[PDB]
């Protein structure tokens, strides 16, 4: 049936321009009333409407983003394009393009969405993480602070995979510096603190950086 | 612009439950309202269009009614796959607004978090920064409040936190908060406190440590 797919750069620098493409199939921007819109979603936020373009080249944008967006269509390539200028870190989000049915009720909705593309705005370059210990002291907790890496993602395991119960690897946060910081903790029995050894295995492939950090009191 | 208010914003349920959810428009949008279910990692999925019509392929349990300014989405018997976030969108006026969303998670008994505070490492102090993190382990519901305090001064704008997904086996959440200071500032103070507020705690819990003690 109808399927759409967004493409472009997952990483963009503040100020630079973001160009995204929506490639679809199963329909054509030639069928009268058909629309293709753009919707974005900041990590942990709600959906935000961006713009819509129809078969006649009819166009509409978000009043708030109006002087920063330009939407077009190529009916030969069956693609829609969105240009967003002077992006800042608040533009980091997942961008979705979608299909809108045309006059045959059913135009009142976006019926088919692409899976979206994650774009991150950072003035940063690839960088490996520094791995710090979160020392412990009934249930006890300990962990690893995987700080200042770029870009995502990073992998963490405990005791070379042999430890999975009680583990909680949290979602990374984008610090104001442009670098990520993530936390991984495992909860255990205080009595095991002195005989068992806990080591987190950190792997940031983007920078070819591997660290094994043993953690104790 | 046209504001769409979704209610409730978050809601907990169990399989086989009957739930109804609402979306209020500040202005009449006729029947031009759509409902979407969005599972984590997955994009929005059309359930209801034109406010009351079930989208082809969508389970019959979903239903929608409303017109003008009031709209509701009902799930007669909710399934495991219905634990997601729901949104309403109006396509009557430009721009085409979306509501803030209703997050539907799994109910389990109220569990207070286990709290742990982690002083920064000596190795990181050299970098010139000090990160102290606070752990809230296995709690429910999801709302928790973390307040950082250095020598009883309330910290603001210098901490970041992230929450895990609701656990598959025990339906709990876990949170991590990080307070970032400069090495100099960390060494200028003594008490580091992480205060946690949450439904399972009658009174707010505080975990602290004195920097050189």
């Amino acid at each position: 049936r109808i399927t759409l797919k967004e493409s472009g750069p997952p990483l963009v620098k503040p100020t630079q321009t973001l160009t995204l493409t929506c490639s679809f199939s199963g329909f054509s921007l030639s069928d009268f009333g058909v629309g293709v819109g753009w919707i974005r979603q900041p990590p942990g936020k709600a959906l935000e409407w961006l713009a819509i373009i129809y078969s006649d080249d009819d166009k509409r944008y978000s009043p708030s983003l109006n002087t920063r967006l330009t939407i077009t269509k190529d009916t030969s390539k069956n693609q829609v394009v969105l240009v967003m200028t002077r992006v800042s870190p608040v533009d980091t989000a997942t961008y979705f393009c979608a299909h809108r049915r045309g006059p045959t009720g059913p135009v009142n909705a976006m019926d088919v969405w692409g899976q979206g593309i994650t774009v991150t705005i950072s003035s940063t370059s690839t960088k490996g993480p520094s791995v710090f210990p979160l020392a412990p002291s009934g249930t006890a907790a300990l962990g690893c602070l995987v700080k200042d890496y770029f870009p995502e993602p990073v992998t963490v395991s405990w005791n070379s995979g042999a430890l999975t119960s009680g583990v909680h690897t949290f979602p990374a946060v984008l610090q104001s510096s442009g670098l990520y910081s993530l936390s991984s903790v495992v909860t255990v029995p205080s009595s095991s603190l002195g005989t068992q050894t806990y080591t987190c295995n950190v792997n940031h492939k983007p920078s070819n950086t591997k660290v094994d950090k043993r953690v104790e009191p | 612009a046209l504001q769409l208010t979704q209610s409730p914003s978050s809601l907990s349920a169990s399989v086989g439950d009957r739930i109804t959810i609402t979306c209020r428009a500040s202005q009449g949008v006729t029947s031009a309202l759509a409902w979407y279910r969005q599972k984590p990692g997955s994009p929005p999925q059309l359930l209801i269009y034109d406010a009351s019509s079930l989208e082809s392929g969508v389970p019959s349990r979903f239903s929608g009614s409303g017109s003008g300014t009031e709209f509701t989405l009902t799930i007669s018997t909710l399934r495991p796959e219905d634990f997601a976030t729901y949104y309403c969108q109006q396509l009557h006026f430009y721009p085409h607004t979306f509501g803030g969303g209703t997050r539907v998670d799994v109910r389990r008994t109220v569990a207070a978090p286990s709290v742990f505070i982690f002083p920064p490492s000596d190795e990181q102090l050299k970098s010139g920064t000090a990160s102290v993190v606070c752990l809230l382990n296995n709690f429910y519901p999801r709302e928790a409040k973390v307040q950082w305090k250095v020598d009883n001064a309330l910290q603001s704008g210098n901490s970041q936190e992230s929450v895990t997904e609701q656990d598959s086996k025990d339906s709990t959440y876990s949170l991590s908060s990080t307070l970032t200071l400069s090495k100099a500032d960390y060494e200028k103070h003594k008490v580091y406190e992480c205060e946690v507020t949450h439904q399972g705690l009658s009174s707010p819990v505080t975990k602290s440590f004195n920097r050189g003690e």
Binding site: - | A1, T30, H92, F93
Partner: peptide, 9 residues
């Protein structure tokens, strides 16, 4: 607002 009406309204 003097809010614009959608293409199909």
């Amino acid at each position: 607002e003097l809010l614009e009406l959608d293409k199909w309204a």
